Design a protein around this ligand. Structure first.
Ligand SMILES: CC(C)CCC[C@@H](C)[C@H]1CC[C@H]2[C@@H]3CC=C4C[C@@H](O)CC[C@]4(C)[C@H]3CC[C@]12C
Ligand SMILES: CC(C)CCC[C@@H](C)[C@H]1CC[C@H]2[C@@H]3CC=C4C[C@@H](O)CC[C@]4(C)[C@H]3CC[C@]12C
Ligand SMILES: CC(C)CCC[C@@H](C)[C@H]1CC[C@H]2[C@@H]3CC=C4C[C@@H](O)CC[C@]4(C)[C@H]3CC[C@]12C
Ligand SMILES: CC(C)CCC[C@@H](C)[C@H]1CC[C@H]2[C@@H]3CC=C4C[C@@H](O)CC[C@]4(C)[C@H]3CC[C@]12C
Ligand SMILES: CC(C)CCC[C@@H](C)[C@H]1CC[C@H]2[C@@H]3CC=C4C[C@@H](O)CC[C@]4(C)[C@H]3CC[C@]12C
Ligand SMILES: CC(C)CCC[C@@H](C)[C@H]1CC[C@H]2[C@@H]3CC=C4C[C@@H](O)CC[C@]4(C)[C@H]3CC[C@]12C
Ligand SMILES: CC(C)CCC[C@@H](C)[C@H]1CC[C@H]2[C@@H]3CC=C4C[C@@H](O)CC[C@]4(C)[C@H]3CC[C@]12C
Ligand SMILES: CC(C)CCC[C@@H](C)[C@H]1CC[C@H]2[C@@H]3CC=C4C[C@@H](O)CC[C@]4(C)[C@H]3CC[C@]12C
Ligand SMILES: CC(C)CCC[C@@H](C)[C@H]1CC[C@H]2[C@@H]3CC=C4C[C@@H](O)CC[C@]4(C)[C@H]3CC[C@]12C
Ligand SMILES: CC(C)CCC[C@@H](C)[C@H]1CC[C@H]2[C@@H]3CC=C4C[C@@H](O)CC[C@]4(C)[C@H]3CC[C@]12C
Ligand SMILES: CC(C)CCC[C@@H](C)[C@H]1CC[C@H]2[C@@H]3CC=C4C[C@@H](O)CC[C@]4(C)[C@H]3CC[C@]12C
Ligand SMILES: CC(C)CCC[C@@H](C)[C@H]1CC[C@H]2[C@@H]3CC=C4C[C@@H](O)CC[C@]4(C)[C@H]3CC[C@]12C
Ligand SMILES: CCCCCCCCCCCCCC
Ligand SMILES: CCCCCCCCCCCCCC
Ligand SMILES: CCCCCCCCCCCCCC
Ligand SMILES: CCCCCCCCCCCCCC
Ligand SMILES: CCCCCCCCCCCCCC
Ligand SMILES: CCCCCCCCCCCCCC
Ligand code: NA
Ligand code: NA
Lengths: 497, 497
């Protein structure tokens, strides 16, 4: 009867009744901690229910922290453009340049010719390809470059319900596989570097964690959880015609024609971007960042420097004969990427969302909410450490679904640092589960910017990724427990304290 | 002969030959100061020559400051989203909402009916109206709301060279008049508040400057320089037909129809935005910011809070009968502004440009370049103070043309604070000329975000605003000298030290 009427006004009802519902939180715990917790929970609920646009919800700290006395306006505001947001923006512009010169179509056609016209084969091929792309680039970047290729693939092989279910699954596989791929390498995603820096600050003595040890630990996790995710996606979606389809694919590749100068320039800039990101500061061999002041350089500088080249590099072959040829027309050359096209194709909503995550994080530590959470976990000492770390990674994997991976790892890592020493257990035994599990962002679009990129297409529903990410998070937590129980205690020698 | 060939490749030639030309600067003065000066001059040249897009040039500090050892990456990047950038973004979104509901057309038609079909009358009317709008709102905001009205006006009265010259002049009058209007009131523009805060920090004893004194000092400057600018624009541009034109104007107003609920809601949100901005913290009567922690609240919080309402407020009249009427269709209501339309219509290039200004400013003080500049001005002591302040405001008015007003005022105000004490003159006699003259941004689009908004239309040329802003800056400097010589020495009692 009235259920349809209530469900029609879902937005305003949630907006007006969420602060009222979360009001007892403020009175439950100390004032600043209570107000910060109220802000965090309000932001999470508004993100999950889509009561406000993700960007608008991300701007909530600017209003809430100063009014509640948590952070000044001059402190919460600069958090929205930390250097990580520049790296993500530079990756987005690089992906925009890749799309704009039809390089994604060439890559997609190459993938179809290599793999074939089989939805399961194509899904798995992009799973491994995007994970490989994510071991060196950020998850948001790799997702922003792999949705163009995936959409080209779909428009290729498909030119009823099976098609559109394949659409849903074929597009859900990319952000998930990017989040999977970010975990194995320290350079793969920001939370790994956050873990390393926080370990250096908290524990100068502990130096067993490097690129090699982290890679040998987490690559099996990549393989296992990637296969598990691929099987889940395949089962949920998809369970002389082949010769004709391959003939059409080859005809389309020939219709693409020879590679243009702009495509080669964009691809070479991509290769330089990835190589400079990886070689900036490896932890086994020093990088080129050692040639300058320590701590002055980051991945944001590399990204911005690479992107700057796209805005003045010519898109056509420059010939010295033009200067001598007075008969040649005097027209300005087209750059690789104009700012107009970039501004049209850059998702600034994602930038604002990441900024909201950073701001809510800084509010969390500054208000003392993180210290309060660490203090509240004190009675978790009689509980055996194994399933204690199990429930810790469960709650971390289920809280990273609201904020970004970077925000949740910054919020929770010092809490785990205090908790591990307080419970006389090995710190890494709690350091690593949180860092890996924060990348398990699968429920909502706001969980990670890759998911927002996925719904940028419009073929994915919230309920679908909710249903998939439930079991994705479950298997991720189970494999984290397996890693902590079998081969983490020897690689990082964390089995003895 | 080859002049056309060289002028064809203006972009790359400037890009490659500007660092080479500015190379001796690094060796001329101490290393960090030299590198910072090189960055500032390179950014200014690239902005003036359009060698790179304004946003791309604004991103130069992220690459240059960390590589040159001036600022760390974690200290340059957050400068791009200081709270000044949220206030401007909120104003841009508010202007977008005003445009999206055709309120600008209603205001424009009202202006034509009040004024008449006369280009000089309309130009002057918008001069005073935009100056009035700028006494309480930021220059960028008021410009972003007044270009829509101006474009509606042009499409109204005009439906050969005289038309298009009127186009140029009619569109140049808005950003200029906004920059004029920002100076008279402390709340008018950010540099006035920067002056007040820097005066409080440097000179706690000096408290003669308040809202009333600044207003009575600078309102005559508004009137004089506004009339001078209006005469210059009129002379440069523009030097029973009237009844029929007025009949068409009235017919268009009737075609607009009755004001919709969305238009009234947007206008009321505008009024609340302006009132809350003005009453947040007046310096003669305390505002509502005194109800909270001191220094926690700013104009950014007010702007974001007001803009947040636009994204969930319904655009249609909500009736309680809908709940009882079970036969009514159950469709979601349209909000006042969706995030998609805002993201389409927000000029993020302006946000990046302002961030580049903030970053280059912080690089300027951190590297010691500001202290070096202050030390170099030591031999300017035998020169009489009058024409010394004249040349000081000349160089300030001619340097604010490259960076934003906020960036240049932050860069130069501490330098003037040291210089005034070093030359045993009244500090305000140097405080005020710099603050007012930094708002004299008239040469280039990068001089102030209002100018970028002006070229957002595309009917303005660089040479035209260069030609106009030359004399605009000249008259502004002359009137600053007049104010410093006649009625500043009594209002601020700065004639005796
Ligand atoms: C927003 C909707 C969708 C989810 C539910 C949120 C609200 C109703 C829930 C979430 C967690 C809840 C709190 C959990 C624990 C406590 C401590 C107790 O001593 C008093 C009640 C209090 C403070 C609860 C109040 C209600 C609460 C804030
Ligand atoms: C996880 C699901 C069930 C609920 C949604 C998450 C939020 C709203 C829940 C999860 C656990 C909850 C907390 C559990 C226990 C306490 C201690 C009590 O003295 C005050 C409330 C407080 C601090 C709760 C606040 C609300 C809380 C943070
Ligand atoms: C083996 C015979 C039949 C075919 C030849 C192999 C071809 C199709 C394979 C071999 C190596 C492959 C490349 C390996 C890695 C990458 C990087 C990835 O980001 C996009 C796809 C791309 C660029 C692949 C395209 C297809 C490729 C070029
Ligand atoms: C191929 C394109 C993308 C350019 C990148 C080339 C890479 C491989 C180059 C460029 C700069 C180089 C670094 C420059 C300086 C040093 C310091 C030295 O004590 C050890 C080697 C090391 C750390 C180099 C390693 C290789 C390096 C990172
Ligand atoms: C590096 C030294 C030589 C100075 C800089 C020379 C630059 C400005 C010159 C060298 C070669 C030139 C290119 C040669 C040929 C063409 C094709 C024609 O449609 C004009 C643009 C374009 C694309 C020229 C742009 C300018 C250019 C790139
Ligand atoms: C919302 C963000 C900032 C943090 C995530 C939710 C936090 C506040 C929740 C998640 C799980 C919660 C804990 C769950 C169970 C217990 C056991 C008992 O002693 C009550 C408090 C305590 C220790 C809770 C404290 C609050 C807690 C840590
Ligand atoms: C970029 C173009 C358009 C404008 C001109 C910029 C270059 C050529 C100019 C601007 C200011 C100049 C500097 C001004 C003063 C000095 C100090 C002197 O002891 C050595 C030369 C040196 C260091 C000049 C070198 C050339 C210079 C850097
Ligand atoms: C204003 C026009 C003429 C030039 C463009 C502005 C820049 C490039 C000019 C204006 C004034 C110039 C400065 C004037 C005097 C000196 C002192 C000398 O020991 C080193 C160079 C230095 C520090 C110059 C550097 C370049 C400079 C800052
Ligand atoms: C005097 C007779 C002939 C006509 C009636 C006067 C009308 C046309 C005038 C009187 C006051 C005027 C308003 C005064 C101030 C503003 C705010 C400005 O931001 C937009 C125009 C607007 C909204 C004006 C519109 C025209 C207006 C309503
Ligand atoms: C009309 C719409 C836009 C709402 C704004 C109303 C304005 C005029 C109201 C709202 C909040 C008010 C302030 C609330 C509290 C105080 C502190 C008191 O010691 C002096 C008055 C002062 C400073 C009020 C001044 C008037 C004020 C600023
Ligand atoms: C404040 C209390 C009453 C709870 C919140 C009630 C809100 C959700 C209700 C009250 C009146 C309602 C509006 C009444 C009429 C219409 C027209 C119809 O096309 C549905 C949408 C719309 C625009 C409704 C949207 C939801 C609404 C604004
Ligand atoms: C580029 C930004 C950061 C600053 C603006 C330009 C600065 C560097 C320029 C503008 C005018 C210049 C001054 C002009 C004249 C003199 C007199 C003599 O003693 C040489 C140095 C000195 C004192 C110059 C120092 C540098 C200076 C202050
Ligand atoms: C004085 C009371 C403090 C605790 C309650 C604060 C409630 C703030 C609600 C903000 C809602 C913003 C979105 C509409
Ligand atoms: C104890 C000092 C602060 C008291 C008020 C805290 C809550 C303020 C909420 C402001 C909400 C503004 C929404 C636009
Ligand atoms: C035979 C190979 C021809 C290659 C042509 C394209 C070269 C593109 C180079 C881009 C370099 C970008 C960084 C300077
Ligand atoms: C070691 C030399 C330091 C001084 C010169 C630095 C030159 C930097 C040029 C950067 C140009 C960026 C736009 C192409
Ligand atoms: C004295 C330590 C720094 C030496 C080098 C200074 C100049 C660096 C320029 C880097 C330019 C990078 C362009 C992409
Ligand atoms: C008779 C007057 C009718 C007015 C209808 C429109 C009212 C709009 C109110 C907007 C309020 C925005 C802040 C809550
Ligand atoms: Na997350
Ligand atoms: Na300026």
């Amino acid at each position: 009867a009235a259920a349809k009427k209530v469900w029609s006004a879902r937005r305003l009802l949630v907006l007006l009744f969420t602060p009222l519902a979360l009001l007892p939180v403020v009175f439950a715990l100390p004032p600043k901690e209570g107000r910060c917790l109220f802000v965090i929970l309000l932001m999470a609920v508004y993100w999950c229910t889509e009561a406000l646009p993700l960007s608008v919800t991300a701007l909530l700290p600017i209003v809430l922290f100063p009014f509640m006395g948590i952070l000044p306006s001059n402190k919460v505001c600069p958090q929205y453009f930390l250097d990580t947001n520049f790296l993500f923006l530079s990756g987005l512009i690089m992906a925009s340049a890749i799309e704009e010169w039809n390089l994604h179509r060439r890559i997609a056609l190459k993938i179809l010719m290599l793999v074939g016209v089989q939805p399961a084969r194509l899904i798995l091929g992009m799973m491994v390809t995007t994970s490989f792309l994510s071991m060196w680039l950020s998850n948001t970047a790799s997702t922003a470059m792999m949705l163009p290729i995936a959409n080209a693939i779909l428009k290729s092989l498909f030119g009823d319900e099976y098609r559109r279910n394949i659409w849903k699954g074929f597009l859900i596989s990319i952000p998930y596989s990017a989040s999977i791929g970010g975990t194995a390498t320290l350079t793969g995603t920001a939370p790994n570097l956050i873990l390393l820096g926080q370990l250096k600050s908290f524990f100068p003595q502990c130096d067993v964690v490097n690129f090699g040890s982290w890679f040998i630990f987490a690559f099996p996790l990549m393989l296992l959880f990637l296969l598990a995710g691929w099987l889940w996606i395949s089962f949920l979606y998809g369970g002389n015609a082949e010769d004709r389809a391959r003939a059409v694919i080859r005809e389309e590749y020939q219709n693409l024609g020879p590679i243009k100068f702009a495509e080669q320039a964009v691809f070479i800039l991509f290769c330089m971007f990835a190589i400079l990101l990886f070689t900036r500061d490896p932890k086994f061999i020093p990088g080129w960042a050692s040639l300058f002041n320590p701590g002055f350089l980051s991945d944001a500088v590399t990204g911005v420097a690479i992107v700057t080249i796209l805005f003045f590099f010519p898109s056509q072959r420059p010939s010295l004969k033009w200067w001598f040829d007075f008969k040649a027309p005097n027209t300005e050359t087209e750059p690789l990427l104009t700012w107009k096209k970039a501004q049209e194709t850059v998702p600034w909503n994602i930038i604002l969302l990441l900024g909201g995550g950073f701001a809510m994080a800084k509010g969390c530590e500054e208000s003392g909410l993180s210290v309060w959470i660490g203090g509240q976990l004190h009675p978790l000492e009689n509980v055996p450490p194994a399933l204690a770390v199990l429930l810790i990674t469960v709650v971390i994997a289920f809280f990273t679904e609201f904020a970004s991976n970077t925000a949740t790892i910054i919020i929770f890592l010092p809490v785990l640092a205090e908790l591990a020493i307080r419970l006389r257990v090995h710190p890494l035994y709690l350091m690593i589960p949180g860092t890996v599990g924060c990348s398990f962002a699968f429920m909502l679009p706001v969980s990670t910017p890759p998911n927002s990129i996925a719904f940028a297409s419009g073929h994915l529903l919230v309920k679908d990724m909710v249903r998939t990410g439930l079991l994705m998070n479950l298997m991720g937590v189970l494999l984290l427990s397996l890693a902590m129980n079998t081969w983490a205690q020897t690689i990082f020698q964390l089995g003895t304290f």
